[PDB]
Write a protein that binds this ligand. Structure first.
Ligand SMILES: Nc1nc(=O)c2nc(CNc3ccc(C(=O)N[C@@H](CCC(=O)O)C(=O)O)cc3)cnc2[nH]1
Ligand SMILES: Nc1nc(=O)c2nc(CNc3ccc(C(=O)N[C@@H](CCC(=O)O)C(=O)O)cc3)cnc2[nH]1
Lengths: 159, 159
């Protein structure tokens, strides 16, 4: 089963040049809870940002180029990614843009973070038709002393 | 000697209801690095938003109220706080606004991060007269893949 996970600002904006101007430790927690013990697939850019492997999870890196770091698994194609995951009950795709795109249609589940933030980004989440998905969980949280903005958690299942 | 350290947004705005809309690890790194193995004065609100002692530093509290946490020292005045600190070369006042206020007149050096961000805040960093201060160091940095905003590090000494 394939599930995408992402943080969306206003207008399906997921990224820009510089780091997103926002502090949401709570988001990282959910991210963490939701992906631990699951293999995670990502792109070269994404991986470059993180800088290290995520622990408690299997990192598969979808890339055309040869990777040196041996602590992660390098792959060249979508099939391979999957193949590299084994017989698990859920594969989590973590981005960025291009991967979300490619894996989007094979996805069956969406964990999404909708952050009330208006920014001018380069990369956007993919467009999916609401029609086709079913909200199974939703939860709003206001900004606070530790989170710079309010946000809402959501889990969409493919209809 | 007393020193203050703080991050200023546009117009000395330093705090608000909900936390600061920005991601600046470099700054967080500068904070830590300039505080590590020293004394730290802070007020209840700051303490509350931090939520745990700052490791590698004696955490002092400046409150009127009594306190339950035994992992920190609580003081009730400026003179206590200072005593509490001991025979060290440099004490560091970390916030918030009021505390900054009180300590300002005693301070001999400031550690400021000037962030390039417009935020509508409640709290400001006190107004100090620039002429009574001498800039010892300043270093500007542009936003990047980590820090969501440009900022400049500055350190002034009392003339
Ligand atoms: N909702 C959501 N928020 C994100 O920030 C996120 N980030 C990506 C891609 N980038 C990242 C970047 C850093 C970390 C990260 O450090 N995750 C840690 C938590 C570390 C911590 O608790 O500080 C992990 O171990 O899960 C994760 C994803 C994909 N989906 C996400 N999904
Ligand atoms: N320059 C400056 N930047 C700040 O962010 C700042 N914040 C405070 C008060 N609030 C805080 C809140 C959290 C941490 C904090 O977590 N510091 C850690 C670094 C952890 C990390 O790198 O994530 C520490 O170990 O001191 C410090 C001060 C006071 N002076 C400041 N001064």
């Amino acid at each position: 089963m394939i599930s995408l996970i992402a943080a969306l600002a206003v207008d399906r904006v997921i990224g820009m040049e510089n780091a997103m101007p926002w502090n949401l430790p709570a988001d990282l927690a959910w991210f963490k809870r939701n992906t631990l013990d699951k293999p995670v697939i990502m792109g070269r850019h994404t991986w470059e940002s993180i800088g290290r492997p995520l622990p408690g999870r299997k990192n598969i890196i979808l890339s055309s180029q040869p990777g040196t770091d041996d602590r992660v698994t390098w792959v060249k194609s979508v099939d391979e990614a999957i193949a590299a995951c084994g017989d698990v009950p859920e594969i989590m795709v973590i981005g960025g843009g291009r991967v979300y795109e490619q894996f989007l249609p094979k996805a069956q589940k969406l964990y999404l973070t909708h952050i009330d933030a208006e920014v001018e980004g380069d990369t956007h989440f993919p467009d999916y038709e609401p029609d086709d998905w079913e909200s199974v969980f939703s939860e709003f949280h206001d900004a606070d002393a530790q989170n710079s903005h309010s946000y809402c958690f959501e889990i969409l299942e493919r209809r």
